[PDB]
């Protein structure tokens, strides 16, 4: 006999297929390679970055923690498994009481004494109904589930390292742009100086020029700080100072990652890490019902051993001192104040809770992937659209640039051209990044990179 | 006896009445209707949204979770309650040992044997001092508390759903604004294209006219994305794909809720969910001192049973095999290494912790409501004040619109009109939301939606 | 014996010294006083704020909690100490059974009875291999750790309060700047009203002049709200409404704190709080291996007591009734299905996990200080460079101010002067703050304020 019920994974309560239209590309359908099976070494192309992932994996503690965390639950599974088996031991015991008149067999105050040394168990429970096999399962699951959770955690170390490198490099490009426009700003302000002591530039076109230059001298220092902060942001996730012998790193403008299929939603149910932890996490608690159930049932204890006894010590390892005990026991509950029903329910409930929980994780995937397909299905278009506000403004730069020094126009159109452009340059870089984020997190949500390499069928 | 001490709820260590002045309206005083008793189906007027709340209730797993949680702690209370009662059962046991000479009663190796099937309890505790009623109350409390926390949770589900539907609708409204100003922008650029190949529009006035249009073409894509992101944001909290047959949903510009009375601070204590869990939480640990105390006291144990025995199996259910046992026990400790003291302390402290925690939650309510009263007491004012920067800009738009195509002026003052307007438009939508937000959160803070309906004394 | 392994604090896996260069000042080297040893009543110079810290110390509930927690862990340690010691009790027990023929000593149904009242211990474990001592140390450690963590959390209450006071004052300075430029803006608009009903000011120059004043009347209400929100932010951390009798608080422009030495990283290991909790946290589980080891070894039980007994109650405290027992026992397991291996692993692992955690905490310290040194090594320069964009913009304000009313120029170069100035003003305050922030947090990460006073050598 064994009392665990029939696992029956619930039906994923999200839409059968991802929603569409209002920013969503076409639904490619069943993918022949899941993102899950697509290794980040492939999905990331930037090899200097790739080898940063390398270093983060082999170093980041929070992943270590999450790795050991498994070794624990295997160990905890072990301990549970043992309890199917009987605890055998060598054991010596004494006893040496005075009794009173009415008690000693002598009818008068005497002092009994028993000694024994033996090899056997006390109170071994003989799983007939599998109260134990159940428990063993609970912890087996809670183990397996932990395995998953580890996988779940790496994909996130990867993603977060991608991301960090990116805000780092991105902020690096947010910087050099500031260098260029610093030399530019100051050269501009110096040609509105000779031209001032020469009266051609007024004090207004001089103060303006000063607000440009100063407007830059500030966003210099900022994208300096936010460079070091992004650097610090990195070595952490690394667990190692960044090595010197890094490969040649690329630049945001490139094409750094593979475009990844989004498959069906149902796909998740066999591939998204946490969503499996969830499942086993559920499974364990289902076991815990079996365990509960069995407490309604006859438990068969068994004490038993064998060795040598006597009345004084001395005659222990001497002839005939041989002894032994056989002491089985069958017990069965007739009244607890529904204690049993009560803590059977607690367990059934806890199942249900984990059912619910499975369902929450699932329904959170849909969300997190959809957000990334909105993002996929919008960011490209925003990338062309902002690419234009660069050109239009670089021309609307050159033209006003010359037109100011040509007496036709003022400085306010020179200046405002500079805003209308610089803004478009920063926001450009940043837009690039967040398209990247969007894709990296998208990579994750569909199964991320447990795999270094890509694998098939 | 029962050594649980006298609960004496502390005094809510915040200001007596909500602070005033620097952005706070008038303090209406005791409200005849607590926001608490005011049901969201009333406090929300948008019936489409209302019914979304409905769906999010019947569906969200996170609530399911938190709801079961109760049931668990009920069962947990059950389990503790059964402990007052004796654990009764059928029970069979054997024993069958060889003894050595000095130990068998025959003075010579013989083999004893005892068999017994009885119906009784072992070491049942009589609750005299109420160590057990104590635990029972601890568990009852951690249960009741858990009821509260469920209520707390739902209010946050409501609030968060209102909010989602909102930023969703607010980004919907953020969008059509960009449809409009897209057709507007391109119309404008094309009337600065005929006018270009015709020489009336320069190349500058063609490149600015290109950056307005371009600056739009991207804020299109963005508010196209941040719409699917907010959509995705919804079905989650829904736990269900949004049904088709929803009523007619309204628009931010309306008047979607009931203004809510802010009542007195004192009011929180009897109505704001979490602030009760806190209390009961505190109360649970209060009992847990009772418990500790009692282990200083005489504990009464009791083993007792009756049925048949014998010296070989067979003669069990036969005549005279009748047996029984009565075996009472009294224990009173006269030395642990101050164990009982130290472990009493723990539970005392733990009460104190929960007192402190009660106080925390109280003082966090004050804050979170007051923030909503600065919010109430300024958002309307920023709503009129921003309503103006729309009109003044729409005029400073019609004007410069004509004035540019009338050759009096340039394009820079057409463009800057466009900025200084569209800016005020978006900022207006967002300021609408944030006012709303602030009010939903305010609703919550004062006792939120437990009740679908609004109920009287 | 004592099987607790030999603690060996791992080597702090970060860079030997603070990263340098791309925004980092000079690395002053070992500091003669750690930021740790330096007092916040000295590091902070605003004495009004200083007494805000005083207030938030003597009150804040979250720190209280955090403090009680210690006491509880002392208590828990206590209880674990006690187990070295034997559990002594006065104790009474009875027994009264009807046997059947073959079992009664009378060969025919009769009813036995035994009574006793004795002062002793049962099953006291003699700590030989120090399994218990081990545990004692475990809970001692986890206690000591809890001590550190408390200190940890105080530094953070300070930091959070410095902060809230700041963003408070910073938002106040953000406000009066708005009062000023409101009287300014309305004056301006009315001088472009007399001049409008007089023809000199156009209708465009009146709608621009209307969107300035309207852009201000708006940013009034906002910075009015985010001051009551930054107020509510404060009394919370305070745990008390802000006293009337505070001293004279300063203004962001001052020099409110002591610049602090950032010493060697190594210094962290001996001074930054959480990094210690972790260490002890590590040490605790270190002991936990000792404890596990020992279960491989013989355990030595000892039931033992003394008193008076008899066969009927009566002759209890009557002559001869004297009795006693001595009943020692040694046990050594020979087989558990690897249970002891497994549960030894779990404990070994749990050490290694705490190793990992020590390492991660250290590695987050680096990060959080480096960020503060980028910050320290940039904010000064962004402060001079933003100081300039103020002057350049107030000049480029006075100029265009007179120049507009002197007919030479339009209003757009009055308005854009106003933007390019006021924006520089707001962002100037904000920048002041974020520098301050960066510096408070810096002071925290390197030991923060345990000490009100500064101590040395
Ligand atoms: C679930 O009840 C499975 C068993 C029922 C089938 C037949 C009976 C077999 C078990 C009898 C138990 C007695 C022997 C146990 C001694 C240790
Ligand atoms: C706290 O317990 C104070 C009272 C003293 C208790 C001492 C022991 C005597 C109690 C007698 C109770 C009889 C009740 C019978 C059970 C149904
Ligand atoms: C851990 O408990 C290991 C157990 C082994 C202990 C060894 C016992 C040795 C006994 C001799 C001690 C006599 C002391 C005289 C010294 C001069």
Residue numbers in the entry:
A (entry chain A), B (entry chain C), C (entry chain B): 1 to 457
Question: Which of the paper's sentences describe this entry?
Answer:
To investigate the lipoyl structure, we decided to solve the structure of the best diffracting dataset limited to 3.8 Å resolution. The here-solved structure comprises two trimers in the asymmetric unit with the second trimer being poorly defined. The crystal packing of our C2 OprM structure is slightly different from the P212121 structure but they share common type I crystal packing in which the homo-trimer channels interact in a head-to-head manner through the hydrophobic beta-barrel domains mimicking a lipid bilayer plane. In contrast, when stabilized by a more packed environment around the N-terminus, the entire fatty acid chain appears in the density map of the C2 form where two different orientations are observed. For the three N-termini, the main chain is stabilized by hydrogen bonds with R133 and the carboxyl group of L128. In each case, the palmitoyl tail then turns around two hydrophobic residues, L128 and F129. Interestingly, Palm-A instead makes short van der Waals contacts with its own symmetric structure, justifying the quality of the electron density map for this region even at low resolution.
This study will focus on the versatile membrane channel OprM, which has the ability to work with at least four different pumps, including OprM-MexAB, OprM-MexXY, OprM-MexJK, and OprM-MexMN. The architecture of OprM is composed of a beta-barrel domain that is ∼40 Å in height spanning the outer membrane and a periplasmic alpha-helical domain that is ∼100 Å in length and bears a central buoy. In this study, we have shown that OprM is palmitylated at its N-terminal cysteine by thio-palmitoylation.
